[PDB]
């Protein structure tokens, strides 16, 4: 009887332990309406959370509470947690221990305030905070490998060999899905479709989730898209309006492999994984090149394992078996792994009881996180 909540910068995948698929799957968004001197009448809420704000998105302002894995607004995150517990799962958090998923290399203030809120506000008996990559490796059915997680606000790589982590070979990159959404929004404005407000950001990310794929040979695909026009597909907005996108489809996730399009001055996800492998020990790099696991929602692009495999193949030596593992359930890998972990017979000693927080306080999380 454990609760597994996956709080990312985008969706908030929540459900019970032992279950295969999570119950609660909703965009973690809060939104205040356009405050004007006029009234409303016959009731309405004050701040819509979840699918409420997703359907009433035409007038409210979408404000994410988590930016790059950092909870930037604890009151909005507290509203999302209250909505999750008392409305999506329909069970109070006092009768169950919860399991939260944070990103690696996360500033300590988040990892501590999360615990302070889960104990002082909801009166939970036990809470554990695990790294999302570890849970993705749990859900991948392996104890050896590197996880190339990619969320909407964060993207990191964590190598774990035979169940042991390498806390120094863990990299992290802020170039994730939300930055791709902003880049696609800017180039769609360049093609003549101004998606200015935050309410249009959900439409442009819907375009990203539906018609954007990873190009294998980006220069060849770009030259053929500028030459031919069969690649240009159509798409309908919530209105009767219809658009056509030619380059945007494959040029949108190109920022993941080429961060120079956003001026990040960094390395792409392929070389981020390559550098994360090279920072490990020289005797366990074969297993990492074979058990490369993709996870998160930003790896759901069609035809991305081929690009990752080609780029790493060009980077890794010729005598290595480059193998990319991309399960179709990688959108919920963190939650599935949280379910597996929460349902283990050993994990009961791995919790953080209420009295432990009563004695130590917020500093016990660092000695009990991982």
């Amino acid at each position: 009887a454990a609760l597994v909540v996956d709080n990312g910068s985008g969706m908030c995948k929540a459900g019970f332990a032992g279950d295969d698929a999570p119950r609660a799957v909703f965009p973690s968004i809060v939104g205040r309406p356009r405050h004007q001197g006029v009234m409303v009448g016959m009731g309405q809420k004050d701040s819509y959370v979840g699918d409420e704000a997703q359907s009433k998105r035409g007038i409210l302002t979408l404000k994410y509470p988590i930016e790059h894995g950092i909870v930037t607004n604890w009151d909005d995150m507290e509203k999302i947690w209250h909505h999750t517990f008392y409305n999506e799962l329909r069970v109070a958090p006092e009768e169950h221990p919860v399991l939260l998923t944070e990103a690696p290399l996360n500033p300590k203030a988040n990892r501590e305030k999360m615990t302070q809120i889960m104990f002082e506000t909801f009166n939970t008996p036990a809470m554990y905070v695990a790294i999302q990559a570890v849970l993705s490796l749990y859900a991948s059915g392996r104890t050896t490998g590197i996880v190339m997680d990619s969320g909407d606000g964060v993207t990191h790589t964590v190598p774990i060999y035979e169940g042991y982590a390498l806390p120094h070979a863990i990299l992290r990159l802020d170039l994730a899905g939300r930055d791709l959404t902003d880049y696609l929004m800017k180039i769609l404005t360049e093609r003549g479709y101004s998606f200015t407000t935050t309410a249009e950001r959900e439409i442009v990310r819907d375009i990203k989730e539906k018609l954007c794929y990873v190009a294998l040979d980006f220069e060849q695909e770009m030259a053929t898209a500028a030459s031919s026009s069969s690649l240009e597909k159509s798409y309908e907005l919530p209105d009767g309006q219809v658009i056509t996108i030619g380059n945007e489809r494959f040029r949108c996730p190109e920022a993941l492999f080429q961060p120079s399009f956003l001026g990040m001055e960094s390395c792409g996800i392929h070389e981020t994984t390559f550098n994360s492998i090279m920072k490990c020990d020289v005797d366990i790099r074969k297993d990492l090149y074979a058990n490369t696991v993709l996870s998160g929602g930003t790896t759901m692009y069609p035809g991305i394992a081929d690009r990752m495999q080609k780029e790493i193949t060009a980077l890794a030596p010729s005598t290595m078996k480059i193998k990319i593992i991309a399960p179709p359930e990688r959108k919920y890998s963190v939650w599935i792994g949280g379910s597996i972990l929460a349902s283990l017979s050993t994990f009961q000693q791995m919790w953080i009881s209420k009295q432990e927080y009563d004695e130590s306080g917020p500093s016990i999380v660092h000695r009990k996180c991982f």
Partner: protein, 369 residues
């Protein structure tokens, strides 16, 4: 428990009654009653003296209470229905009257479009108010009005009266007892209103196109009946003017601004998500909206302007549908305010209390502080 008097103003006819009462108890015009007054000056006027409007509002609301409400203004709440974009000076004058001469428990300057939406029960629609002075469009989404999306046109009942006055003054065939034109320099508004309701009517879309062809090189429908007038000054209306009066109401004149075009303009400024829900929920309120064939020609004009190569590429194929309110289009907003006034739960906290106005003086309006 006490009731709530729902007062609704208007430049032509004021509407008033109680809370929960389906339909107002009386609909008295905005005229006054005073000795030595050949023409009663309207109560709802703008850009004029302050104290004069204070006295006019005092006497009109006083006679309104004591002649169609039969109750002292201290035992029950007052919900003053006022349309949005009403001048602040007019609202301040109403507040001064209701709190310095009558001393009501709490007023509520609630908008008109929002309660017109409350009548249907749904939380989102596009509301076209064909009032007397001007036309007004105000999109409402999830109970919140999209105030930046608005539209006004001086093509209400006043423009119809101006049209009828000029046109009937031209073809003034008042028989003797044969032409006799311009016998009187100006004709009143009562006869003009009677001509509007009893004789004028809204034409068809194809008939309107025939009138457009009749503008410059034929008026196809010719029915007419010689409208009488007291003092044996019997005039004769024409079979084409009964069509031209509505033709100017649905005229564009190379500016693309007709009564039906205003809804499409406000729909253009609305956000992408709200588009199909406002198209699926269209409400037509107002007094000018009670003309025979007005809704049919209105919807036909909307759908005729849908495939116009200026608004089609942004709207396209849409499902336009007009709702049918459970009250008359001339008095829908009042019924919405009546249902709102019959809700004594939060109205005590939603409305402006008397104590707060006496000790503060500030009136809530969409303005800073």
């Amino acid at each position: 428990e006490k009731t709530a008097v729902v007062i609704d103003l208007g430049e032509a006819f004021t509407k008033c009654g109680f809370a929960g009462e389906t339909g107002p108890r009386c609909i008295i015009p905005s005229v006054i009653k005073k000795a030595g007054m050949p023409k009663p000056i309207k109560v709802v006027q703008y850009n004029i003296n302050t104290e004069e409007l204070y006295s006019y509002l005092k006497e009109f609301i006083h006679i309104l209470y004591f002649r169609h409400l039969l109750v002292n203004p201290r035992d029950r709440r007052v919900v003053v229905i006022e349309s949005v974009l009403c001048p602040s000076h007019f609202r301040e004058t109403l507040t001064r009257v209701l709190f310095k001469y009558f001393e009501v428990p709490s007023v509520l300057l609630a908008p008109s479009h929002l309660m017109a939406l409350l009548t249907l029960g749904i939380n989102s629609a596009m509301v076209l108010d064909c009032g007397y002075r001007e036309s007004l469009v105000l999109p409402i989404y999830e109970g919140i009005p999209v105030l930046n999306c608005w539209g006004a046109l001086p093509l209400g009942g006043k423009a119809l009266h101006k049209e009828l006055e000029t046109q009937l003054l031209e073809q003034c065939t008042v028989d003797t007892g044969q032409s006799l034109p311009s016998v009187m320099g100006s004709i009143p508004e009562g006869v003009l209103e009677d001509i509007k309701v009893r004789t004028c009517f809204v034409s068809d879309l194809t008939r309107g196109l025939k009138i457009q062809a009749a503008k410059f090189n034929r008026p196809s429908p010719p029915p007419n009946v010689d409208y009488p007038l007291d003092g044996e000054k019997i005039l004769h209306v024409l079979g084409s003017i009964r069509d031209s009066v509505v033709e100017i109401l649905f005229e564009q004149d190379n500016e693309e601004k007709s009564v039906a075009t205003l809804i499409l303009d406000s729909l253009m400024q609305c956000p992408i998500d709200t588009r199909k829900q406002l198209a699926e929920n269209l409400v037509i309120i107002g007094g000018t909206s009670m003309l025979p064939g007005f809704l049919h020609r209105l919807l036909a004009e909307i759908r005729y302007l849908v495939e116009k190569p200026k608004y089609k590429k942004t709207l396209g194929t849409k499902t336009f549908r007009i709702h049918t309110p459970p009250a008359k289009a001339n008095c829908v907003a009042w019924l919405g305010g009546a249902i709102f006034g019959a809700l004594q739960d939060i109205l005590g906290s939603r409305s402006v209390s008397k104590e707060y106005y006496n000790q503060t003086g500030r009136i809530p309006d969409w303005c800073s502080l």
